């Protein structure tokens, strides 16, 4: 019959596990990609970017997505020890790491049996192979259940404060700002809201989005960054605006601007790792101490520094002469993700918006 | 716990068509089933339409068994703010879905399929046009719009600089629209100009509502102008004109907007500039086309609107048919974990 019309209809389709980590979307694509050339997760990401970028666009943007959508493609692992390969994507490009989506992915690996649950277990390890290195996750099980996840935590790739007290001149009305740059899986410009002359509130979202874009543009133009072990990482993809908390349980509140100036509704896992490295570098957070970060929505992530390391003969701008090498810390983050749908994305060839669009200005 | 749907769009404008998972909903006509959803179960709409499952320009509907005689499919429309269609674009989507997926059957060797929708507002009569050599591939859909009419003509509304005073026509096609040339506002219609068109459209809407006080003659509940339709020269030379409808809480229609097309049509038609059976083509801000024609006109004795002249016996009203294409962009199973702090959604949109 017209089951031939269904073969046809599904041609070039993708299956996804639609999730969110505390309000922030994680559209996890589980099939429909062909083989993508590349020896590692970094090379697969570049391949996707240089040759098949219309895929990111149609999956992330209206009408299938929206100006603040986020997601990822899964792959077989390449790296030894890894359960899953993952490349992240968004409305602008491809982050080398993402905490909220890594939490979601750990959760989904376990809740759908991608990874199997050792009979009588409380914690299930799930190791993601990312463009930034191995990320070791743990799904913390709902104690009297088979595969029901309470929350998920990740041990991030080594994070470190990169350059301190950088002056960036933005145009009026914002003027001159002081920022730290730090790596937490992505490079971040960390800036106090107080300096943008704007409060973190829903009401000021569009202005915090403008200001993040200008800051990100101006940093990349003025300041060259380079990850000392990962040559492919050499820009600042995200801006962290922080300010006083609203939930008293939380050290601070933040919004992250990234992608095509979209805002994280989560507190942002990599950005959390990046603030933690910074305070820790400054002797303002101790190993083991709990740091709680609140989002614009009021979502919470919990973090702690599990250890530190000094790497002899490797310096970054912030590394003083009196130091024997650069400081990195290993940060853990914990949060909760939910499955919000099992989606099959279709692309009618006659659809003028099979490759997505945004009405976002300029 | 879970809902099934067909994600669609009508030339860019989202239409989430929920095809199962609602509980049993009472009502002896669709308007009562809509009231019951509103009064007892609004949370379903919110979680299906708002982030994270949705977004601030999401629209859609719930499919039901039809009740009205003649009807093929029951439906209640919804969006992130409420329970109306607006622009009518879900109707095109649902007519298409119904044929595409088997809800409605196709007579053999048939080229066009009637799909009649049972909505809270009355029957909506549509036709699915079949792709030449196929049995249920839909090329497009036509909808018979609610009766439309020019209401008031050459209205002078005074806007703050830089817009100034602006000549508009006010016309009904499901909502009342203020139809206003882009030239009049001094903004060229483009995506990059959209926020300027938005500012201006709101300015215009508040200014008209404050000064002109419009009233549907047979529908007293409709006493404002909720949409501003900004038109100008087309980019596609197949199209008569190009437009963007500004409506809601600072929102733009990505489609040409079917009811605005029907309003624009009754306007041209009243001024002697469109003929019955003439294909009018309208382009959106993203380049899509809708096609309309006026099928017929009527007079309504003893009922008058401002544009109705002293010697005319009743207002002029027209019936237009609006054609457009809806695409299927997904088949989704949505889930609501009861412990999900966002099972009923959120919005970061502010006013
Ligand atoms: O969770 C994160 O690391 C992240 C980065 C951008 C959005 N979320």
XYZ file of C-alpha atoms and ligand atoms in Angstrom:
721
model
C 0.000 0.000 0.000
C 1.077 3.590 0.832
C 3.716 2.243 3.254
C 6.002 3.333 0.373
C 4.817 6.924 1.154
C 6.056 6.359 4.700
C 9.527 5.124 3.598
C 9.701 8.281 1.460
C 8.413 10.585 4.283
C 11.078 9.417 6.774
C 13.969 9.716 4.375
C 16.576 11.894 6.057
C 14.768 11.909 9.354
C 16.406 11.968 12.834
C 15.194 10.304 16.040
C 15.755 12.345 19.209
C 15.396 12.079 22.931
C 14.131 15.467 23.826
C 15.185 16.479 27.258
C 15.688 19.422 29.538
C 18.070 19.975 32.410
C 16.184 22.321 34.748
C 14.491 24.238 31.866
C 17.321 24.181 29.319
C 16.694 22.001 26.252
C 18.951 19.155 25.294
C 17.765 17.719 21.982
C 19.759 14.477 21.896
C 19.883 12.970 18.367
C 20.110 9.177 18.596
C 19.960 8.234 14.898
C 19.823 9.347 11.235
C 23.415 10.643 10.942
C 25.573 8.813 8.400
C 29.241 8.146 9.017
C 31.038 11.433 9.825
C 34.808 11.369 9.115
C 37.132 12.105 12.033
C 39.527 10.299 14.390
C 38.106 11.958 17.498
C 35.066 13.880 18.601
C 36.747 17.189 17.797
C 37.301 16.251 14.138
C 33.719 14.960 13.712
C 32.462 18.305 14.986
C 34.547 20.286 12.553
C 33.463 17.996 9.741
C 29.847 18.659 10.689
C 30.491 22.308 10.843
C 32.419 22.713 7.590
C 30.344 20.353 5.436
C 26.932 19.537 7.002
C 25.995 22.646 9.018
C 22.499 22.870 7.529
C 21.750 19.893 9.885
C 22.446 21.781 13.088
C 20.333 24.616 11.641
C 17.224 22.600 10.846
C 17.256 20.646 14.105
C 18.008 23.696 16.307
C 16.022 26.502 14.740
C 12.424 27.355 14.018
C 10.236 25.791 13.001
C 11.509 22.510 14.496
C 13.394 24.325 17.326
C 13.692 27.938 18.462
C 16.039 30.781 19.190
C 17.063 29.204 22.573
C 17.252 25.523 21.714
C 20.266 23.338 22.434
C 21.237 19.779 21.660
C 23.723 17.099 20.599
C 24.527 14.196 18.206
C 25.467 10.889 19.771
C 28.200 8.651 18.304
C 29.910 5.414 19.137
C 32.777 6.071 21.514
C 36.319 6.325 20.114
C 38.274 7.071 23.266
C 39.102 4.147 25.632
C 36.742 3.959 28.598
C 33.969 5.949 27.021
C 30.388 4.732 26.755
C 29.176 7.439 24.324
C 30.535 9.928 21.839
C 28.827 13.268 21.830
C 29.150 16.496 19.875
C 27.105 19.441 21.082
C 25.343 22.032 19.005
C 23.305 25.205 19.405
C 21.795 28.141 17.495
C 25.211 29.536 16.547
C 27.683 26.601 16.435
C 29.333 23.850 18.385
C 30.527 24.059 22.071
C 33.428 21.736 22.956
C 31.631 20.900 26.231
C 28.254 21.337 27.835
C 27.318 20.495 31.434
C 23.531 20.615 31.188
C 23.470 18.408 28.092
C 26.083 16.057 29.618
C 23.854 15.672 32.672
C 20.920 15.035 30.333
C 22.909 12.510 28.326
C 24.062 10.543 31.367
C 20.439 10.508 32.567
C 19.127 9.373 29.171
C 21.814 6.674 28.695
C 20.554 5.110 31.857
C 16.790 5.761 31.560
C 16.713 4.204 28.005
C 19.237 1.455 28.419
C 21.919 2.890 26.112
C 24.179 1.895 29.021
C 23.226 -1.028 31.200
C 22.539 -0.994 34.952
C 24.673 -3.403 37.085
C 22.114 -5.525 39.008
C 21.567 -4.038 42.533
C 23.330 -0.670 41.801
C 22.859 2.802 43.314
C 25.169 4.660 40.881
C 25.753 3.953 37.205
C 28.835 5.410 35.619
C 28.433 6.903 32.138
C 31.553 8.226 30.452
C 31.096 10.663 27.580
C 33.701 11.132 24.868
C 33.517 14.932 24.084
C 35.470 17.386 21.944
C 37.042 18.732 25.154
C 38.184 15.311 26.543
C 36.590 12.507 28.628
C 33.789 13.495 31.006
C 33.011 10.992 33.758
C 29.387 10.986 34.762
C 27.393 9.162 37.373
C 23.638 8.700 37.339
C 22.442 8.557 40.974
C 19.550 6.112 41.119
C 16.194 6.474 42.839
C 17.045 4.019 45.534
C 14.246 1.402 45.239
C 14.109 1.213 41.448
C 15.561 -0.450 38.370
C 16.589 2.502 36.132
C 14.959 5.650 37.601
C 17.392 8.574 37.955
C 17.229 11.142 40.763
C 20.013 13.296 39.392
C 23.281 13.034 37.551
C 26.690 14.418 38.156
C 29.706 14.936 35.958
C 33.404 15.230 36.600
C 34.414 17.847 34.116
C 37.530 18.061 32.088
C 40.283 20.013 33.850
C 39.267 23.611 34.346
C 41.539 26.562 34.927
C 41.544 30.317 35.204
C 43.293 31.709 32.127
C 43.717 35.473 32.311
C 42.721 37.855 35.039
C 41.436 41.457 35.037
C 41.159 41.908 31.295
C 39.878 45.374 30.302
C 37.404 45.241 27.325
C 35.941 48.474 25.948
C 32.370 47.929 24.797
C 30.387 50.706 23.006
C 27.911 52.914 24.954
C 25.834 52.489 26.920
C 28.067 49.763 28.468
C 31.562 51.344 28.190
C 34.647 49.781 29.791
C 34.543 46.374 31.610
C 36.810 44.152 33.747
C 36.504 40.355 33.152
C 38.282 37.108 33.852
C 38.663 34.495 31.137
C 38.475 30.932 32.239
C 38.170 27.479 30.730
C 35.507 25.124 32.093
C 35.141 22.971 28.925
C 34.564 26.159 26.922
C 36.422 29.449 27.358
C 34.363 32.004 29.295
C 34.499 35.703 29.831
C 33.257 35.969 33.413
C 31.872 39.348 34.274
C 29.890 40.832 37.150
C 26.475 42.125 36.031
C 27.119 45.150 38.274
C 29.593 46.234 35.563
C 27.136 46.040 32.691
C 24.831 48.351 34.613
C 22.197 45.622 34.425
C 20.434 43.420 36.904
C 19.942 39.682 36.254
C 16.175 39.440 35.841
C 13.821 38.115 33.186
C 12.959 41.740 32.489
C 16.519 42.514 31.359
C 17.068 39.373 29.233
C 17.301 41.052 25.831
C 19.843 43.571 27.233
C 21.977 40.858 28.864
C 21.859 39.140 25.419
C 23.111 42.294 23.572
C 25.826 42.766 26.195
C 27.004 39.177 25.981
C 27.340 39.330 22.207
C 29.298 42.591 22.331
C 31.539 41.238 25.022
C 32.179 37.981 23.213
C 32.915 39.807 19.931
C 35.232 42.291 21.605
C 37.122 39.691 23.600
C 37.806 37.499 20.551
C 38.920 40.502 18.548
C 41.191 41.919 21.371
C 42.430 38.838 23.195
C 43.744 35.689 21.582
C 43.119 32.576 23.670
C 44.627 29.144 23.253
C 44.059 25.974 25.245
C 47.553 24.686 26.034
C 46.671 20.920 25.403
C 43.814 21.219 22.903
C 44.895 23.254 19.835
C 41.401 23.249 18.309
C 40.090 25.469 21.163
C 41.105 29.101 20.577
C 38.136 31.407 21.114
C 35.790 32.526 23.772
C 32.397 31.020 23.036
C 30.451 32.100 26.150
C 29.823 35.057 28.442
C 28.948 34.521 32.107
C 27.134 37.385 33.773
C 26.995 36.900 37.560
C 25.407 38.764 40.390
C 23.830 38.352 43.840
C 21.586 35.301 44.389
C 17.824 35.242 44.943
C 17.657 31.792 46.545
C 19.673 32.146 49.803
C 20.992 28.559 49.287
C 23.019 29.874 46.358
C 26.423 31.581 46.399
C 25.493 33.575 43.242
C 23.112 33.899 40.223
C 24.169 33.893 36.545
C 23.011 33.901 32.957
C 25.248 32.587 30.160
C 25.122 34.130 26.688
C 26.407 31.908 23.857
C 25.429 30.560 20.449
C 23.599 33.199 18.398
C 23.335 35.235 21.546
C 20.900 32.747 23.198
C 20.663 32.519 27.067
C 21.126 29.409 29.228
C 18.062 28.727 31.338
C 20.178 26.280 33.348
C 23.009 27.611 35.597
C 25.399 26.240 33.021
C 27.698 23.372 33.982
C 30.852 24.511 32.183
C 30.304 28.057 33.362
C 29.883 26.740 36.892
C 33.190 24.857 36.474
C 34.767 28.039 35.216
C 33.646 30.232 38.182
C 34.896 27.483 40.545
C 38.324 27.386 38.987
C 38.444 31.155 39.352
C 37.514 31.438 42.996
C 39.758 28.439 43.756
C 42.701 30.036 41.923
C 42.004 33.092 44.095
C 41.905 31.106 47.399
C 38.134 31.759 47.730
C 36.801 28.201 47.435
C 38.409 25.135 49.061
C 38.636 21.577 47.773
C 35.478 19.771 48.861
C 33.373 22.876 49.528
C 29.962 23.040 47.949
C 29.250 25.916 45.588
C 25.663 26.456 44.456
C 24.792 28.398 41.323
C 21.342 29.716 40.495
C 19.975 30.363 36.956
C 17.655 33.173 35.768
C 14.790 30.667 36.198
C 15.943 29.803 39.758
C 17.328 26.374 38.813
C 20.186 25.089 40.948
C 23.358 23.211 40.112
C 25.676 22.072 42.904
C 29.405 22.003 42.376
C 32.612 21.109 44.146
C 36.337 20.991 43.396
C 37.597 17.427 43.835
C 41.299 18.065 43.450
C 43.889 20.366 41.982
C 46.969 20.073 39.863
C 49.977 22.125 38.883
C 51.490 21.232 35.472
C 55.228 22.111 35.397
C 56.508 24.283 32.504
C 53.077 25.028 31.124
C 51.969 28.629 31.767
C 48.966 30.698 30.683
C 48.736 34.507 31.020
C 47.585 34.367 34.653
C 50.524 32.119 35.678
C 53.029 34.178 37.724
C 56.787 33.933 37.545
C 56.754 32.743 41.131
C 54.646 29.675 40.023
C 55.998 26.223 38.958
C 53.295 25.827 36.298
C 49.598 26.300 35.674
C 46.834 25.447 38.093
C 44.002 23.214 36.942
C 41.191 21.898 39.135
C 38.829 18.974 38.613
C 35.197 20.140 39.244
C 32.122 18.026 39.742
C 28.663 19.338 38.898
C 25.310 17.867 39.795
C 21.842 18.533 38.446
C 18.601 16.991 37.261
C 17.371 16.252 33.740
C 14.000 15.059 32.461
C 12.778 13.310 29.298
C 10.277 15.616 27.714
C 9.703 13.594 24.485
C 10.634 10.971 21.970
C 10.722 12.942 18.723
C 11.135 11.948 15.073
C 12.251 14.995 13.002
C 11.122 15.047 9.386
C 12.327 17.101 6.428
C 9.976 17.393 3.539
C 12.204 18.221 0.531
C 9.675 20.843 -0.692
C 9.842 22.619 2.729
C 11.525 26.000 2.298
C 12.444 25.902 5.981
C 13.892 22.378 6.135
C 17.117 24.161 7.081
C 15.540 26.354 9.723
C 15.392 30.119 10.103
C 15.707 32.713 12.831
C 14.102 36.162 12.928
C 16.880 37.131 15.334
C 18.376 40.452 14.387
C 21.877 40.628 12.763
C 1.410 11.293 31.161
C 2.087 11.258 27.435
C 0.634 12.962 24.325
C 0.977 12.136 20.693
C 1.262 14.797 17.962
C 2.050 15.943 14.519
C 4.251 18.916 14.468
C 3.584 21.005 11.476
C 4.096 24.447 10.132
C 2.154 26.536 7.690
C 4.743 28.431 5.725
C 6.949 28.898 8.812
C 4.221 29.370 11.439
C 4.121 26.517 14.032
C 1.127 24.197 14.409
C 1.400 21.377 16.964
C -1.543 19.001 16.224
C -2.187 16.789 19.271
C -3.737 13.605 18.012
C -4.069 11.616 21.336
C -3.596 11.459 25.105
C -6.143 13.928 26.326
C -8.506 12.432 28.808
C -12.233 12.252 28.109
C -13.615 15.756 27.827
C -17.294 16.562 28.222
C -19.276 18.922 26.153
C -22.218 18.696 23.866
C -20.628 21.042 21.271
C -16.985 22.072 20.760
C -17.422 25.379 22.538
C -18.291 23.485 25.764
C -15.258 21.186 25.346
C -13.073 24.297 24.985
C -14.694 25.885 28.180
C -14.033 22.627 30.138
C -10.355 22.661 29.042
C -10.102 26.264 30.025
C -11.758 25.900 33.406
C -10.406 22.513 34.465
C -7.305 21.688 32.503
C -5.410 24.729 31.282
C -2.171 23.128 32.482
C -2.182 20.783 29.497
C -2.081 23.653 27.026
C 0.703 25.346 29.012
C 3.006 22.254 29.077
C 2.399 21.391 25.416
C 2.875 25.013 24.115
C 5.451 26.703 26.424
C 9.189 25.989 26.939
C 10.877 23.627 27.319
C 8.630 21.414 25.089
C 7.422 24.422 23.196
C 8.408 28.063 22.780
C 6.928 31.574 22.797
C 5.664 31.449 19.172
C 4.168 27.986 19.423
C 0.563 27.358 18.339
C -1.472 24.223 17.892
C -4.542 22.169 18.623
C -6.300 19.222 20.142
C -8.129 16.846 17.832
C -11.580 15.420 18.985
C -14.419 13.372 17.525
C -16.646 15.649 15.529
C -20.105 16.444 16.926
C -21.694 18.866 14.447
C -23.426 17.088 11.537
C -21.354 17.391 8.393
C -18.070 17.700 10.225
C -15.051 15.401 9.843
C -12.968 16.386 12.755
C -13.381 18.189 16.084
C -10.701 20.643 17.102
C -9.882 23.245 19.742
C -7.107 25.721 18.931
C -4.587 26.944 21.411
C -1.404 28.960 21.701
C 0.898 30.081 24.455
C -1.525 32.753 25.530
C -5.010 31.224 25.110
C -7.539 29.313 22.972
C -7.970 31.077 19.617
C -6.725 30.340 16.030
C -5.690 33.919 14.906
C -4.594 34.186 11.301
C -6.500 30.764 10.937
C -3.229 28.846 10.123
C -3.966 25.789 12.244
C -6.958 25.115 10.031
C -4.747 24.612 7.020
C -2.446 22.452 9.100
C -5.289 20.279 10.449
C -7.008 19.874 7.062
C -3.589 18.722 5.668
C -2.824 16.395 8.692
C -6.229 14.838 8.395
C -5.620 13.780 4.815
C -1.912 13.191 5.120
C -2.296 10.728 8.000
C -5.549 8.973 7.265
C -8.076 10.624 9.532
C -10.048 11.471 6.411
C -10.348 9.007 3.454
C -9.796 9.771 -0.217
C -12.378 8.811 -2.928
C -10.569 6.812 -5.618
C -9.018 8.842 -8.475
C -10.057 11.978 -6.457
C -8.133 15.196 -6.764
C -9.483 17.352 -3.883
C -10.814 16.156 -0.474
C -13.274 18.106 1.643
C -12.337 18.243 5.362
C -14.870 20.014 7.535
C -13.686 21.088 10.997
C -15.966 21.400 14.049
C -14.476 24.268 16.099
C -15.802 26.355 19.055
C -16.419 29.232 16.605
C -18.490 27.184 14.090
C -17.827 24.938 11.084
C -14.638 25.679 9.106
C -14.869 24.220 5.581
C -11.604 23.231 3.948
C -10.278 21.352 0.926
C -7.099 19.299 0.687
C -5.661 19.453 -2.879
C -3.847 16.260 -3.897
C -0.478 16.210 -5.561
C -1.053 15.181 -9.217
C -0.059 11.533 -9.320
C -0.826 10.482 -5.733
C -3.461 9.181 -3.304
C -2.794 11.328 -0.171
C 0.231 13.538 -0.703
C -1.251 17.032 -0.062
C 0.075 19.864 -2.253
C -1.981 22.495 -0.394
C -5.205 23.345 1.399
C -8.015 25.895 0.978
C -10.156 27.326 3.769
C -13.365 29.295 3.514
C -12.674 32.276 5.744
C -15.281 33.842 8.076
C -17.157 36.639 6.316
C -14.854 39.642 5.979
C -15.434 43.325 5.333
C -13.877 46.720 5.217
C -15.049 48.451 8.391
C -13.533 51.889 8.114
C -11.498 53.597 5.524
C -8.812 56.372 5.476
C -8.438 56.500 9.271
C -5.862 59.059 10.315
C -3.942 57.958 13.406
C -1.285 60.240 14.851
C 1.853 58.358 15.970
C 4.878 59.878 17.804
C 7.943 60.736 15.690
C 9.477 59.258 13.699
C 6.236 57.711 12.326
C 3.896 60.702 12.573
C 0.397 60.651 11.170
C -0.532 57.484 9.281
C -3.423 56.543 6.993
C -4.900 53.101 7.692
C -7.882 51.005 6.825
C -9.645 48.919 9.381
C -11.065 45.649 8.247
C -12.366 42.417 9.789
C -11.210 38.941 8.780
C -11.421 37.021 12.127
C -9.865 39.699 14.111
C -10.040 43.324 13.157
C -6.805 44.485 11.479
C -5.365 47.913 10.877
C -3.969 47.660 7.393
C -1.197 50.157 6.845
C 1.425 50.582 4.096
C 5.040 50.228 5.237
C 5.794 53.408 3.244
C 3.457 55.220 5.612
C 5.596 54.116 8.618
C 8.867 54.712 6.725
C 10.269 51.216 7.378
C 11.069 48.861 4.478
C 9.709 45.356 5.209
C 12.581 43.041 6.000
C 13.682 40.606 8.765
C 16.441 42.995 9.923
C 13.819 45.748 10.257
C 11.381 43.533 12.189
C 11.837 45.112 15.620
C 11.147 48.610 14.100
C 7.958 47.199 12.434
C 7.022 45.663 15.817
C 7.511 48.929 17.742
C 5.485 50.779 15.147
C 2.715 48.200 15.003
C 2.201 48.299 18.800
C 2.314 52.095 18.730
C -0.393 51.927 16.072
C -2.537 49.353 17.831
C -2.611 51.183 21.166
C -3.197 54.489 19.357
C -6.154 53.159 17.339
C -7.821 51.379 20.183
C -7.545 54.520 22.289
C -9.117 56.765 19.552
C -11.332 54.810 17.169
C -13.450 52.302 19.208
C -14.392 49.655 16.618
C -17.314 47.202 17.049
C -18.346 44.099 15.108
C -22.061 44.567 14.371
C -23.060 40.846 14.994
C -20.302 40.011 17.523
C -20.212 42.406 20.500
C -17.308 40.581 22.226
C -14.965 42.015 19.514
C -14.382 45.639 20.323
C -10.723 46.253 19.641
C -8.171 46.067 16.887
C -5.756 43.331 17.799
C -3.635 43.063 14.661
C -1.678 45.377 12.523
C -0.984 44.297 8.955
C 1.917 46.170 7.353
C 2.122 45.758 3.549
C 4.350 46.718 0.667
C 5.813 45.841 -2.720
C 6.518 42.164 -3.193
C 9.894 40.530 -3.622
C 8.519 37.560 -5.486
C 7.052 38.862 -8.777
C 4.436 36.111 -8.568
C 2.951 37.996 -5.583
C 0.687 41.071 -5.469
C 2.191 42.396 -2.223
C 4.260 41.458 0.814
C 3.147 41.662 4.469
C 3.901 41.187 8.127
C 1.147 40.965 10.756
C 2.144 42.260 14.245
C -0.180 40.881 16.914
C -0.232 39.383 20.459
C 2.438 40.356 22.927
C 5.077 41.691 20.513
C 4.805 38.820 18.044
C 5.148 38.554 14.255
C 3.456 36.054 11.924
C 6.037 34.251 9.773
C 3.317 33.204 7.330
C 1.357 35.613 5.106
C -1.453 35.234 7.650
C -4.675 33.833 6.190
C -7.272 36.038 7.945
C -5.188 39.180 7.302
C -5.127 38.097 3.671
C -8.908 37.779 3.852
C -9.171 41.261 5.438
C -6.832 42.812 2.826
C -8.994 41.151 0.212
C -12.269 42.611 1.480
C -10.550 45.947 1.532
C -9.326 45.790 -2.136
C -12.690 44.345 -3.010
C -14.635 47.244 -1.460
C -12.465 49.742 -3.383
C -13.117 48.013 -6.743
C -9.549 46.658 -7.067
C -10.118 42.931 -6.875
C -12.654 40.871 -8.754
C -14.534 37.770 -7.689
C -12.453 34.733 -8.871
C -9.233 36.741 -9.089
C -6.280 35.077 -7.474
C -4.693 37.530 -5.047
C -1.180 36.307 -3.978
C 0.333 37.472 -0.583
C 4.004 37.092 0.367
C 5.321 36.836 3.914
C 8.392 38.435 5.421
C 10.266 35.127 4.820
C 9.246 34.712 1.234
C 6.302 32.300 1.419
C 3.138 32.680 -0.648
C -0.593 32.373 0.206
C -3.280 32.722 -2.504
C -6.771 33.906 -1.994
C -9.913 34.475 -3.963
C -13.202 36.222 -3.248
C -15.970 33.716 -4.041
C -19.014 35.944 -3.480
C -20.340 39.048 -1.779
C -23.451 39.827 0.265
C -25.398 42.766 1.728
C -26.870 42.758 5.231
C -30.015 44.909 5.337
C -30.272 47.397 8.173
C -26.775 46.652 9.580
C -24.151 49.346 8.847
C -20.507 50.046 9.544
C -18.630 53.323 9.126
C -17.619 52.750 5.480
C -21.307 51.985 4.541
C -22.732 54.889 2.554
C -26.109 56.571 3.299
C -27.864 55.206 0.217
C -26.473 51.672 0.706
C -29.092 49.524 2.520
C -26.676 47.335 4.495
C -22.959 46.708 4.980
C -21.017 44.862 2.335
C -19.449 41.530 3.351
C -17.406 39.068 1.226
C -16.503 35.356 1.355
C -12.854 34.594 0.564
C -10.969 31.396 0.254
C -7.395 31.236 1.429
C -4.933 28.663 0.163
C -1.612 27.647 1.675
C 0.762 24.809 2.371
C 1.400 23.120 5.763
C 4.379 20.759 6.182
C 4.851 17.884 8.592
C 8.071 18.532 10.526
C 7.816 15.824 13.164
C 5.962 13.010 14.878
C 6.419 13.502 18.617
C 5.496 11.696 21.850
C 5.596 14.289 24.637
C 6.159 13.260 28.248
C 5.204 14.824 31.592
C 6.998 13.432 34.562
C 4.941 14.457 37.598
C 8.073 15.510 39.476
C 9.287 17.668 36.614
C 9.337 21.192 37.990
C 8.579 22.422 34.442
C 5.790 19.933 33.512
C 3.543 22.996 32.982
C 6.130 25.051 31.240
C 7.600 28.443 31.636
C 8.091 31.638 29.626
C 10.850 34.227 29.894
C 8.777 36.525 27.667
C 7.908 39.731 29.540
C 5.554 42.752 28.907
O 25.912 23.547 30.652
C 26.768 24.119 30.003
O 27.969 23.922 30.166
C 26.279 25.057 28.985
C 27.030 25.835 28.093
C 26.112 26.551 27.341
C 24.836 26.210 27.777
N 24.974 25.300 28.773
